[PDB]
Design a protein around this ligand. Structure first.
Ligand SMILES: *[C@@H]1O[C@H](CO)[C@@H](O[C@@H]2O[C@H](CO)[C@@H](O)[C@H](O)[C@H]2NC(C)=O)[C@H](O)[C@H]1NC(C)=O
Ligand SMILES: *[C@@H]1O[C@H](CO)[C@@H](O[C@@H]2O[C@H](CO)[C@@H](O)[C@H](O)[C@H]2NC(C)=O)[C@H](O)[C@H]1NC(C)=O
Ligand SMILES: *[C@@H]1O[C@H](CO)[C@@H](O[C@@H]2O[C@H](CO)[C@@H](O)[C@H](O)[C@H]2NC(C)=O)[C@H](O)[C@H]1NC(C)=O
Ligand SMILES: *[C@@H]1O[C@H](CO)[C@@H](O[C@@H]2O[C@H](CO)[C@@H](O)[C@H](O)[C@H]2NC(C)=O)[C@H](O)[C@H]1NC(C)=O
Ligand SMILES: *[C@@H]1O[C@H](CO)[C@@H](O[C@H]2O[C@H](CO)[C@@H](O)[C@H](O)[C@H]2NC(C)=O)[C@H](O)[C@H]1NC(C)=O
Ligand SMILES: *[C@@H]1O[C@H](CO)[C@@H](O[C@H]2O[C@H](CO)[C@@H](O)[C@H](O)[C@H]2NC(C)=O)[C@H](O)[C@H]1NC(C)=O
Ligand SMILES: *[C@@H]1O[C@H](CO)[C@@H](O[C@H]2O[C@H](CO)[C@@H](O)[C@H](O)[C@H]2NC(C)=O)[C@H](O)[C@H]1NC(C)=O
Ligand code: NAG
Ligand code: NAG
Ligand code: NAG
Ligand code: NAG
Ligand code: MN
Ligand code: MN
Ligand code: MN
Ligand code: MN
Ligand code: MN
Ligand code: MN
Ligand code: MN
Ligand code: MN
Lengths: 5, 539, 927
């Protein structure tokens, strides 16, 4: 969520 | 009794597929400069030819999303130096490559707001020591050495921020308006590959960050090779990008990962002339989209006017396929590099205004070459002419881009264009911005719909009997190339597996039953497989 | 349509402080006077160690124009430990949002950061402050135990705010969760009553809030914009908010309940990256007492004339209908990069016409991107799409665009005059402009001359210079004016009369004024009440017949007039204006007596005639229609003759003809003025006797639905003659006809199969398509083209099922497209054969077992079709290569259709029928 999952 | 001239003041001539201009000064538009002189309410028809010159030099700037998520898609990015070069060699003698990277606005919400002051060197609240985020850094100007490129590209690593969207539009912009820094050769085919992991920040998004000033489409990338106004000015809008992208004659390519493709496809529908390429298998580069893209980018020729005075309106007729001449159009698609085309413009004033040079260009998008036209004019209670709709007086004098008696008819043909990009799905004519289907049992806005139209195994048939047999109508018309592109290939006596396609069957004039198969993988790739060795009458 | 633009209240602020980034009206209950509130984030404050904390300033419209800040915090950062601050107020953007109800005013610092109560952080949770004269509490609904960028860590609540009618606050915060967004409404007194300076995370009782949602909803930015009105059946206010990044950058505008905080309605952008929702605003624009939604997409791209995309901006005006749903329209900008829908600010009823107004702003518009404010007006039908006035920025640049119009508020009359004002704010220069609404007077003209028909040889009055008896006529010009608000009592005018104006520079001014032989006499005047109509009159003569010629060309008297300034209120002197659509002139005309004779009065005999050229018009499209008129005058000269053509609601006027020789080119001019659409044609002013005309009138009717058997026109000639003034009224009707060109197209997928048949095996008891054979498909389409629609038809399909007890082309299953239900007289797919796994030639139902399929159809309008999709399998038992000559077959199926019912009752109709066949030929390929 975001700059990742 | 009214001298309305149009003397062609310039005439370099189309270079014959001469990629390298050895003191030959490459030109791709024949009439280089004409000069109109106009009587009030007069027109003068003229023409222009444009050529997709062979071996045209290419520049390729790579804008890479270096945020923590691309981590899985890197290293083999050695490819770039090597993989661009090779797969592009077969199209150019001169190829300069360069690249830059971006992350996001190093600020307030996006950036890793100093939680522990020990985090101006990110992803430490997990640990991988990914270096600080930057916005947009220009690492390597367009050069010749692919090995020098092969390396500096391996030195790059992932940084990290918190927002899913990453901006980078900010990069696309600076990459475009910083011609000096980037080294854009005004004579080569300019490319800009945008490789990203996910979403993106569009304009206005930066209000959260407290940024309320619009992108000035200016270059703000100095000595330290970093976009300085990054933190002081919003992301650029689709319009400004579009504009600057087209002025600096640059082509945006969207080499993005699968999960996020349709997004950049939808985004490309708004920045016309932009292509999307999938970059997923492992991840560092795949199938050299660039090649297939550059090919695609150069598939059509579209004329674009620049600086045309209000008074004179331009009408077009574009002869694309062998002197066929298609009226009311100014773009030809299906072209292969090397083909030549011609459109006939017809400028025309409506009661000549006041004198001045009033020069203006007409040029194919993506090219430096342009036909400049210097204009000049020889002019030295209730009007019932109406009925409304742009109709002026004396007796109806329609404005630019409006024909017809009542002036209700448009010169526009954009609203007639299909998903594939062909005028009315290739089944009807555009009539006042609206298709009127040359009904083989069809209908629909752009005559796209036709459920009763014969099986595809009838359209493709003519191709196999042309491309693989040299003997059918499509050949008998000399139009079995730009008109029958696809990609035929003599299958090895056996039929394919991909059960999501159809397999056809027919009898050629030689009374033998030929067997083929239409298929479409990922770039919508059209591919036919003809059973090498058709069943024939034995004896 | 009118607000002074000569002397608006100009207020300024410190350089680099964005003075004017958010504006408002502060109207205290305990005070006679009101003020302007100007948010100015970036503005430095006396707060200990805080840089650019911001500050709302209270401005005095006392024509003093001094603005001094309003004390909200004053303190600086609190601590969690020693040198480990709890909050960081420096650069918090306090004042970015400003809202005032009565005495209480909410303000916020959307960029306020906070170190969580746990680890060393710095999260932009955002905070607000609610003042009430002296009492001041801090409202920070996002500062909670629920942290990080998963909870409300980056909420920035306060980014947008608003008060509901019954004191409750709608607050928005974009960064909640993962930039999904959030709306949190808390009632006021709760926010005040529960304030406890010792709790950093206060729990409010009746708090409404929008919880976290599914991951795919991240970065949607709900709460970028906030507006509020009644959308549910009834009650108070409901929450309306723009989500600019919803539906993958398309944008959306969510509407919630003011009670449950549940979802009411949704709106979606049409184009990506356009920012549908950057600005929202609800208002009742059409006096029906229903809120109307207005969304803003300042980056929308419409197609210019040349059809090339243009970023000009677009506002979506959704009119709330009775049923609960809406009726939306669009409205694009005028200049590119102007950012049209940037700020949509509702005004009162800027002209007190009884309908609401609003102003959209393109802050980066105009010359030098100074910015433009466009004010539109409300009407019964909805919102009038044409900018009734345009406010234009008038400030330099100095660093960045003035962004004039980036913020604005209007809905309160900051002064005397009963008209709402407006405050536009330009933070690029650090200013805010108060524009006062001007008083609108609607004035009525009056002009009538005593003798209308002047008499050459009639001596009635004594000429001034020499006592002679010249042809006398008198002319009076009354004038009533009516105001609304502050202005009345002293109405000074400047009326002017012109005699025989058809005479340009030629100076054949046939009529002249008495006491001053001239055709140009002017006068001054006054009045006051809205019913009080002071009057005046003059004496004009007709110079001796011996000094001019005419043969009658009406002597037209022209009355124009004007108002003056120095007619309004003390403060700056705010002069009024005539209503928008008020003509300043009125003409009346005299006709010299001529050819009327001994009977003495022209008594004309008018007669209107018309023909049945093209006796019918089919239901659907725009049918071209021409009326062949014949206006005659068999009596005397009819003055101001004019044909009045009454057209229905279905019809429309194109023009006359001109493309003919026998038809005349009348001076016709369409005019629905009164609740009557009319054509009106100059039949020649003094339409002389025995004048016979014949012209054509072009119309185009669509329909009024079943609306009886015919549409009709009413014809009648009129004139300003005292006697036999008109012609009879002649009605002309035309019959509505029915025409539905329906047709049945059919096709076969493999329209030919070669029997050698690639690798196949004969199964004892088959169980799959591969085991059976190839897939022959038949597509049948019934499509209505004819203009007229049909409501019920019948489709019949005959299928080649078996030949001598042997299957051939076995139907598996069929699908339908459009309004049709179907039925097979035999069970389809009797062996449950499911998809995938590990007579010489023609075979019609005439020579074969028939699998019939009957279809019920109903209503295919204009250009709609209906399609049957039959999917079968060649049995491959079309296989007797052992004897005779099996070799070739033509498996034929066929479908028919019979249209049997139209929506038009009492209209003549004939049944529509036709059929078609579709063949699939199986032949022994090589044999
Ligand atoms: C508020 O005051 C600050 C400084 O007191 C102004 O800006 C600061 O000034 C320094 C010194 O020139 C500059 O480096 C920066 O502009 C600011 N300092 C820092 C650390 O950021 C600021 O312009 C004033 N704001 C207004 C609206 O007047
Ligand atoms: C308006 O749109 C939103 C988002 O598309 C809808 O909300 C979602 O509704 C589904 C169905 O219950 C939930 O699973 C999601 O959690 C909701 N997401 C959000 C962000 O609200 C909403 O239903 C729509 N409202 C209307 C009236 O159609
Ligand atoms: C008086 O005559 C007319 C008013 O009826 C004015 O002329 C134009 O009238 C049309 C009516 O549709 C308007 O659209 C124009 O805008 C009017 N002209 C102007 C300049 O406003 C005329 O101006 C009036 N006054 C005089 C002195 O003739
Ligand atoms: C199917 O075969 C039949 C004939 O077997 C074709 O129908 C017509 O057949 C007659 C008989 O020779 C011809 O004269 C006509 O020209 C044929 N019609 C057409 C349109 O060609 C029919 O063509 C074949 N249809 C398909 C789909 O294969
Ligand atoms: C505006 O353009 C339209 C283009 O369709 C024309 O209208 C036509 O519409 C009718 C449809 O039944 C045709 O039958 C007519 O030939 C034509 N209308 C007329 C008056 O000729 C036309 O050029 C313009 N529309 C109008 C009302 O004139
Ligand atoms: C026609 O049927 C399908 C069309 O998609 C193809 O069949 C091939 O692929 C299928 C799916 O994997 C396999 O089940 C078939 O065995 C395979 N055919 C062969 C010869 O390998 C192909 O285009 C055509 N197949 C045949 C048998 O004609
Ligand atoms: C059925 O189809 C069309 C009308 O839509 C007409 O069919 C005939 O029209 C042409 C012959 O002049 C050809 O297009 C067709 O082959 C021909 N077919 C037949 C059977 O006549 C015909 O008028 C229509 N019939 C009805 C009752 O609507
Ligand atoms: C892209 O646009 C098309 C519709 O034109 C459709 O696939 C979908 O709505 C969009 N998908 C995404 C991911 O934006
Ligand atoms: C387009 O059609 C042909 C193309 O040469 C020619 O008439 C001219 O260029 C255009 N039409 C007109 C009427 O000028
Ligand atoms: C609120 O309660 C539920 C939740 O949405 C719903 O059934 C009802 O219609 C809503 N409105 C009212 C007035 O209760
Ligand atoms: C006599 O004089 C006027 C002159 O125009 C004439 O029209 C009318 O018949 C008479 N006037 C009056 C007031 O009766
Ligand atoms: Mn990322
Ligand atoms: Mn990834
Ligand atoms: Mn980011
Ligand atoms: Mn309500
Ligand atoms: Mn309403
Ligand atoms: Mn109003
Ligand atoms: Mn006022
Ligand atoms: Mn008489």
């Amino acid at each position: 969520r975001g700059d990742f999952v | 009794e009214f001298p309305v001239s149009e003397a062609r003041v310039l005439e370099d001539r189309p270079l014959s597929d001469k990629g390298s201009g050895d003191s030959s000064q490459v030109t791709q538009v024949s009439p280089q400069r004409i000069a109109l002189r106009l009587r009030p309410d007069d027109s003068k028809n003229f023409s222009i030819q444009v050529r997709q010159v062979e071996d045209y030099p290419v520049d390729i700037y790579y804008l890479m999303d270096l945020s923590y998520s691309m981590k899985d898609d890197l290293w083999s990015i050695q490819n770039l130096g090597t993989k661009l070069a090779t797969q592009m060699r077969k199209l150019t003698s001169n190829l300069r490559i360069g690249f830059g990277a971006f992350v996001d606005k190093p600020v307030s919400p996006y950036m890793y707001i100093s939680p522990p002051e020990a985090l101006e060197n990110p992803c430490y609240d997990m640990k991988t020591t990914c270096l600080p985020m930057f916005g947009y850094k220009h690492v390597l100007t367009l050069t010749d050495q692919v090995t020098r490129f092969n390396e500096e590209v391996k030195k790059q690593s992932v940084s990290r921020n918190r927002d899913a969207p990453e901006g980078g539009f900010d990069a696309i912009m600076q990459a475009t308006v910083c011609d000096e820094k980037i080294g854009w050769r005004n004579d080569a085919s300019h490319l800009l590959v945008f490789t990203t992991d996910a979403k993106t920040h569009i304009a206005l998004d930066g209000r959260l960050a407290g940024i309320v000033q619009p992108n000035d489409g200016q270059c703000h990338v100095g000595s330290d090779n970093h976009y300085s106004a990054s933190t002081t000015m919003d992301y650029p809008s689709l319009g400004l990008m579009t504009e600057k992208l087209s002025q600096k004659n640059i082509n945006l390519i969207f080499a993005v990962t699968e999960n996020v493709v349709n997004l950049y496809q939808n985004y490309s529908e708004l920045i016309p002339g932009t292509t999307v390429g999938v970059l997923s298998m492992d991840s560092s580069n795949v199938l050299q989209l660039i090649v297939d893209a550059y090919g695609k980018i150069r598939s059509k020729v579209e004329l674009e006017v620049r600086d045309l005075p209000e008074e004179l309106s331009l009408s077009f007729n574009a002869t694309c396929l062998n002197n066929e001449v298609i009226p009311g159009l100014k773009s030809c698609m299906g072209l292969k590099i090397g083909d030549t085309v011609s459109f006939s413009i017809e400028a025309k004033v409506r009661g000549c205004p006041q004198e001045k040079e009033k020069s203006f260009t007409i040029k194919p998008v993506g090219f430096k070459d342009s036909l400049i036209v210097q204009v000049t004019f020889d002019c030295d209670k209730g009007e019932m002419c109406s009925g409304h709709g742009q109709c002026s007086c004396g007796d109806c004098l329609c404005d630019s881009d409006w024909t017809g008696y009542y002036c209700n008819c448009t010169t526009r043909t954009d609203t007639c264009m299909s998903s594939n990009g062909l005028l009315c799905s290739g089944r009807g004519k555009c009539e006042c911005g609206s298709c009127v289907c040359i009904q083989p049992g069809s209908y629909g806005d752009t005559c796209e719909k036709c459920p009763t139209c014969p099986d595809a195994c009838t359209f493709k048939k003519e191709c196999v009997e042309c491309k693989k047999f040299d003997r059918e109508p499509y050949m008998t018309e000399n139009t079995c190339n730009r008109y029958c592109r696809d990609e035929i290939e003599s299958v090895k006596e056996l039929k394919d597996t991909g059960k999501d396609a159809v397999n056809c069957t027919y009898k050629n004039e030689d009374d033998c039953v030929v067997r083929f198969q239409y298929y479409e993988d990922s770039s919508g790739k059209s591919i036919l497989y003809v059973v090498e060795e058709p069943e024939c009458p034995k004896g | 349509f009118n607000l002074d633009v000569d002397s608006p209240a100009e207020y300024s602020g410190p350089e680099g402080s964005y003075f004017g980034f958010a504006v408002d009206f502060f109207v205290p209950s305990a005070s006679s006077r009101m003020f302007l509130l100007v948010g100015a984030p970036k503005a430095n404050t006396t707060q200990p160690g805080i840089v650019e904390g911001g500050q709302v300033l209270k401005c005095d419209w006392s024509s003093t124009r001094r603005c001094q800040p309003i004390e909200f915090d004053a303190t600086g950062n609190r601590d969690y430990a020693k040198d480990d601050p709890l909050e960081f107020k420096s650069h918090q953007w306090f004042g970015a949002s400003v809202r005032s109800k009565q005495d209480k005013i909410l303000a916020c610092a959307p960029l306020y950061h906070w170190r969580t109560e746990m680890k060393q952080e710095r999260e932009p949770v955002g905070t607000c402050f609610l003042q009430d004269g002296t009492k001041t509490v801090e409202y920070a609904p996002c500062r909670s135990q629920d942290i990080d960028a998963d909870g409300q860590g980056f909420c920035q609540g306060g980014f947008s705010i608003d008060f509901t009618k019954a004191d409750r606050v709608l607050l928005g915060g974009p960064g909640s969760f993962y930039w999904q967004g959030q709306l949190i409404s808390d009632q006021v007194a709760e926010i005040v009553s529960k304030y406890d300076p010792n709790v950093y995370s206060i729990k409010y009782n009746n708090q409404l809030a929008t919880r976290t949602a599914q991951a795919i909803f991240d970065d949607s930015y709900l709460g970028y914009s906030v507006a509020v009105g009644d959308f549910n059946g009834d009650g108070i206010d409901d929450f309306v908010s723009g989500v600019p990044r919803a539906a993958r950058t398309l944008g959306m505008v969510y509407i919630y309940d003011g009670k449950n905080m549940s979802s009411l309605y949704n709106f979606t952008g049409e184009q990506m990256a356009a920012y549908f929702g950057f600005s929202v605003a609800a208002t009742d624009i059409n006096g029906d007492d229903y809120a109307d939604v207005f969304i803003g997409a300042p980056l929308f791209m419409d197609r210019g004339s040349d059809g090339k995309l243009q970023e000009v901006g677009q506002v979506s005006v959704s009119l709330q209908r009775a049923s609960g749903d809406f009726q939306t329209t669009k409205l694009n900008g005028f200049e590119v990069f102007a950012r049209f829908g940037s700020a949509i600010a509702p005004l009162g009823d800027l002209d007190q016409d009884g309908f609401n107004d609003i102003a959209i702003a393109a802050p980066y518009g105009g010359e030098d991107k100074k910015g433009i404010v466009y004010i539109f007006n409300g009407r019964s039908t909805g919102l009038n799409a044409v900018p009734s006035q345009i406010l234009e920025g008038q400030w330099a640049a100095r660093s960045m665009p003035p962004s004039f119009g980036y913020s604005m508020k209007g809905a309160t009359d900051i002064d005397k005059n009963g008209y709402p004002d407006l405050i536009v704010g330009a933070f690029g220069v650090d200013r805010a402009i108060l524009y006062r609404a001007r008083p609108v007077i609607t004035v009525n003209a009056g002009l009538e001359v005593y003798p209308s028909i002047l008499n050459q040889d009639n001596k009635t009055c004594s000429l001034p210079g020499t006592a002679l008896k010249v042809s006398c006529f008198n002319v009076r010009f009354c004038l009533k004016a009516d105001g609304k608000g502050v202005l009345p009592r002293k109405l000074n005018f400047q009326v002017e009369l012109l005699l025989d104006k058809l005479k340009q520079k030629g100076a054949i001014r046939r009529a002249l004024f008495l006491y001053s032989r001239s055709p140009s006499h002017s006068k001054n005047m006054t009045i006051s009440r809205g019913g009080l109509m002071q009057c005046e009159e003059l004496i004009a003569y007709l110079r001796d017949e011996s000094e001019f010629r005419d043969k009658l060309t009406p002597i037209t008297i022209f009355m124009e007039y004007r108002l003056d300034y120095r007619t309004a209120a003390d403060t700056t002197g705010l002069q009024p204006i005539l209503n928008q659509f008020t003509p300043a002139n009125i003409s009346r005309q005299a006709h010299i007596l001529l050819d009327c004779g001994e009977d003495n009065v022209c008594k004309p005999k008018l007669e209107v005639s018309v023909d049945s050229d093209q006796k019918k018009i089919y239901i659907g499209d725009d049918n071209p229609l021409t009326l062949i008129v014949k206006a005659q005058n068999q009596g005397e000269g009819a003055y101001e003759a004019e044909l009045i053509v009454s057209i229905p609601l279905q019809a429309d006027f194109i023009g006359v003809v001109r493309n003919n020789e026998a038809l005349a080119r009348l001076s016709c001019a369409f005019k629905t003025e009164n609740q009557t659409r009319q054509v009106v044609c100059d039949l020649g002013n003094p339409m002389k006797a025995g004048t016979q005309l014949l012209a054509g009138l072009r119309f185009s009717v669509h329909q009024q639905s079943e609306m009886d058997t015919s549409v009709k026109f009413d014809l009648q000639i009129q004139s300003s003659n005292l006697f036999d003034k008109v012609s009879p009224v002649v009605s002309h009707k035309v019959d509505l006809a029915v025409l539905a060109a329906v047709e049945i197209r059919g096709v076969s997928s493999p329209d030919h199969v070669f029997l050698p048949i690639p690798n196949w095996e004969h199964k004892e008891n088959p169980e799959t398509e591969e085991d059976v054979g190839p897939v022959v498909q038949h597509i049948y389409e019934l499509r209505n083209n004819g203009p007229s629609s049909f409501s019920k038809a019948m489709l019949h399909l005959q299928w080649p099922y078996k030949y001598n007890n042997n299957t051939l082309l076995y139907i598996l299953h069929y699908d339908i497209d459009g309004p049709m239900n179907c039925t097979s007289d035999m069970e389809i797919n009797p062996l449950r054969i499911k998809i995938s796994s590990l007579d010489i030639h023609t075979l019609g139902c005439g020579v074969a077992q028939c699998l019939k399929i009957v279809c019920q159809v109903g209503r295919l309008d204009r250009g709609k079709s209906a399609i049957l999709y039959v999917k079968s399998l060649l049995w491959t038992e079309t296989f007797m290569n052992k004897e005779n000559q099996n070799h070739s077959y033509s498996l034929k199926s066929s479908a028919s259709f019979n249209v049997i019912e139209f929506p038009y009752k009492n209209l003549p109709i004939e049944d529509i029928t036709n059929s078609t066949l579709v063949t699939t030929n199986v032949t022994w390929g090589i044999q």
